[PDB]
Design a protein around this ligand. Structure first.
Ligand SMILES: *[C@@H]1O[C@H](CO)[C@@H](O[C@@H]2O[C@H](CO)[C@@H](O)[C@H](O)[C@H]2NC(C)=O)[C@H](O)[C@H]1NC(C)=O
Length: 326
């Protein structure tokens, strides 16, 4: 039921976008070493106003932290009962001052020594947010490598209104073995070297640990990733190919300008889109309307509570991706 859209300030939020979301999560505000939150940027403030103007039911939240934020500052703030209290008071004050409806904790990543203190922090934060009805969420990781040591999912669930499960970045600049899909729905059959680098594995991990799956959102990306000088398939499937050189992460809106989308291969087992261009040896893994349709159907079939998007401003001007989710 939920459509949770993260927003980075790549371009203005449009009135059509705001009407397709239940929650808009502005990214990011960061705490300093002492727990003061960074001021809301102009581009994020503009999107807050645009969103509420176009959709009076929309909940606009601030994501605190981020993939590019030192997680040791979260450890320090949350571990000390005194600084935990003042940080939480600062967050609640920040929501009031900036006319926000809630916040998303984006801690990348909690370690084994953070597991219990993260739960205490979220529980205490919800208590402070409850009188105003402010919405609390957090972003969850996608592999057991991070999930097992750092995430007490039952405890997190008991504190938050929903969990935004980040089912993407399964392959990237760190991958040394081959190309692969940024965000497949499933394992891709017998040629797939991995059982776990897919959204279905990640969501099943969460489903086995949480009490109520309605509190989960399955995350989907509106971006893809490129490699260059890519060679032959490893074991007969063109999704996993001999590595050349990592390229970059590309927003959907910028893909068609640089890749020939008529050469898209849709992997029928993994449910993922890629392009291998035999002329240039460029490789692109991405999500497209078909993969998002398959993902929305999966969410409905499994009874998962919603879909999360990173990030809605990466969509094209005609909202090809958001309209396929919608
Ligand atoms: C999605 O993931 C689930 C969970 O891993 C897969 O279901 C398992 O499938 C294996 C192989 O058939 C069985 O050993 C388990 O009994 C299944 N567990 C559950 C809870 O169903 C499922 O196959 C995956 N879906 C796809 C399309 O790959």
């Amino acid at each position: 039921h939920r459509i949770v859209g993260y927003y980075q300030g790549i371009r203005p939020l449009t009135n059509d976008q705001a009407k397709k979301l239940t929650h808009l999560i502005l990214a990011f505000s960061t705490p300093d070493s002492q727990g003061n939150l960074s001021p809301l940027s102009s581009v994020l403030k503009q999107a807050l106003k645009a969103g509420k103007s176009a959709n009076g039911a929309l909940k606009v939240m601030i994501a605190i932290g981020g993939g590019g934020f030192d997680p040791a500052i979260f450890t320090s703030l949350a571990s000390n009962s005194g600084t935990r209290k003042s940080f939480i008071n600062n967050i609640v004050s920040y929501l009031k001052t900036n006319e926000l409806d809630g916040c998303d904790i984006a801690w990348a990543f909690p370690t084994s020594s953070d597991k219990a203190i993260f739960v205490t922090f979220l529980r205490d934060l919800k208590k402070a947010m409850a009188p105003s009805g402010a919405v609390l969420s957090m972003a969850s990781a996608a592999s057991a490598f991070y999930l097992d040591p750092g995430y007490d999912l039952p405890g997190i669930e008991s504190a938050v209104d929903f969990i935004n499960v980040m089912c993407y970045d399964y392959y990237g600049s760190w991958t040394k073995t081959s190309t692969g899909p940024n965000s497949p729905l499933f394992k891709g059959g017998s040629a797939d070297p991995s059982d776990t680098l897919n959204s279905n594995w990640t969501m099943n991990y969460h489903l086995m640990k949480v009490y109520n799956r309605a509190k989960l959102n399955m995350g989907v990306p509106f971006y893809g990733k490129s490699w260059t000088n890519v060679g032959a398939p490893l074991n007969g499937d063109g999704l996993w190919r001999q590595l050349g050189t990592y390229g970059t992460e590309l927003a959907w809106r910028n893909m068609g300008k640089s890749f020939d989308m008529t050469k898209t291969t849709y992997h029928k087992t993994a449910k993922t889109a890629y392009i291998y261009d035999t002329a240039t040896k460029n490789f692109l893994t991405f999500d497209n309307p078909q993969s998002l349709k398959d993902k929305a159907k999966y969410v409905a079939e499994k009874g998962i509570g919603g879909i999360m998007i990173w990030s809605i401003d990466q969509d094209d001007d005609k909202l090809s991706l958001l309209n396929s989710v919608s």
